[PDB]
């Protein structure tokens, strides 16, 4: 199966500037027609898959000129000569001279902004989960850039390990930060053995980890 | 005036059949082929097959090893896509392609169809608050949301003060977990100065379950 290869996996953008998007095949996609079966698809957020650039270097009607397809027997690349906010989700490589259909790993672009620390806040279970058996603790890093962060747990300065799980929002559209949740699970019972539940943030934004914490049972 | 609408959002319990509608218009139906395409959540697009309206004939990837069929209907311009014998890693979105002759591979795609296998029982969330306290310490900028936990299947909408207040607010993507269940939070930044002013609830919508609650998020 001709394997398509994309590099990079994550390529943040700076608005105005240039923007490049690689893409290699184990095989030579070009035929005896002269015809190379390299195709370039778009995923906007949210949205279905667009053709974007149809055999290497052919622009679909519509996509701004900004945009190009060049190519060379197996490295193929996409090219914005100026990036938009509006080009931003997932590009897919893909060929079609062979069966089955095989496309690349995606390169998804995002917008490249002033790092920014995250706010850091830490919440305890709910007294009404407590009386339920169990206590989710809650830690959240709010607006922050890049996405890249180390959170990690430490109950009565001990370190945690799979305790916990995280989730990140997608890149705001108005400021272009992120947003991470790490909770903690732990019984009702395994959670009055402990007091101090601690979340330690590290970030590009940080000169150093910072840490926000809580005892148990007392505000 | 080429448009593919398929069919809704579809549950199945493991080692179960789905079968998926794509409704084609604006073409000659018959002579343009139909490609079905997958993308498991978070993960790349994969090439599951495509027919031929015009013949029947069609082309599998092999890895399916035959728990695709492809289907088309000409007298209605619908093409069908059935999958057997479904596993959790079945768990995506599909969709159908239309090709148009001279190199234009895949260039109409439908809206999508959500498939997600597991064996968990449609359930209602919990709704816990995540109060909003601080105290000393400095920085002074509130945060507060709602833990909305233990629900099945996906979607769940949340929104703050009936949808008055959208400015700040985040709701992170659901999370599954060892439990057949799914679970998430949305938060929301505020002015600490004003959480004795403004009266702070987090609506949860739960359509799968018929389940809405309105929890309040008070201080302490």
């Known amino acids: 199966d001709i394997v398509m290869t994309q590099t990079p996996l994550s390529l943040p953008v700076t608005p105005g500037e240039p923007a490049s998007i690689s893409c290699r095949s184990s095989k030579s996609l070009l035929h005896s027609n002269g015809i190379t079966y390299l195709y370039w698809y778009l995923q906007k957020p949210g949205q279905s898959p667009q053709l974007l650039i149809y055999?290497?270097?052919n622009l679909v009607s519509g996509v701004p000129d900004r945009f190009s397809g060049s190519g060379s027997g197996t490295d193929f690349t996409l090219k914005i000569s100026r990036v938009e906010a509006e080009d931003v989700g997932v590009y897919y490589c893909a060929q079609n001279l062979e069966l089955p259909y095989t496309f690349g790993g995606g390169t998804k672009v995002e917008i490249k902004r002033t790092v920014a620390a995250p706010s850091v806040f830490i919440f305890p279970p709910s007294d009404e989960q407590l009386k339920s058996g169990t206590a989710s603790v809650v830690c959240l890093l709010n607006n922050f850039y890049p996405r890249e962060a180390k959170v990690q747990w430490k109950v009565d300065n001990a370190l945690q390990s799979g305790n916990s799980q995280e989730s990140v929002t997608e890149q705001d559209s108005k400021d272009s930060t992120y947003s991470l949740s790490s909770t903690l699970t732990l019984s009702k019972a395994d959670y009055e053995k402990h007091k101090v539940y601690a979340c330690e943030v590290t970030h590009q934004g940080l000169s150093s980890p910072v840490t926000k914490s809580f005892n148990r049972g007392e505000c | 005036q080429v448009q593919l609408v398929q069919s809704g959002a579809e549950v199945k319990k493991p080692g179960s059949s789905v079968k998926v509608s794509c409704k084609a218009s604006?073409?000659?139906?018959?002579?343009?082929?139909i490609n079905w395409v997958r993308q498991a959540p978070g993960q790349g697009l994969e090439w599951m097959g495509r027919?031929?309206?015009?013949?029947?004939?069609?082309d599998y990837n092999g890895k399916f090893k035959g728990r695709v069929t492809i289907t088309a209907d000409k007298s209605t311009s619908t093409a069908y896509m059935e999958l057997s014998s479904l596993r959790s890693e079945d768990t995506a979105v599909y969709y159908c392609?239309?090709?148009?002759?001279?190199?234009?591979?895949?260039?109409?795609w439908g809206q999508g169809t959500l498939v997600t296998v597991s064996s968990a029982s449609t359930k209602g969330p919990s709704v816990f608050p995540l109060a909003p306290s601080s105290k000393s310490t400095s920085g002074g900028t509130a945060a507060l949301g709602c833990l909305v936990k233990d629900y099945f299947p996906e979607p769940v909408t949340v929104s703050w003060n009936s949808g008055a207040l959208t400015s700040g607010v985040h709701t992170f993507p659901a999370v599954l977990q060892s439990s057949g269940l799914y679970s998430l939070s949305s938060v929301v930044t505020v002015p600490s100065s004003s959480l004795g002013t403004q009266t702070y609830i987090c609506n949860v919508n739960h359509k799968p379950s018929n389940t809405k609650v309105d929890k309040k998020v008070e201080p302490k």
């Open positions: 604006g073409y000659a139906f018959s002579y343009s082929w």
């Open positions: 392609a239309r090709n148009v002759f001279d190199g234009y591979w895949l260039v109409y």
């Open positions: 027919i031929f309206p015009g013949d029947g004939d069609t």
């Open positions: 055999q290497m270097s």
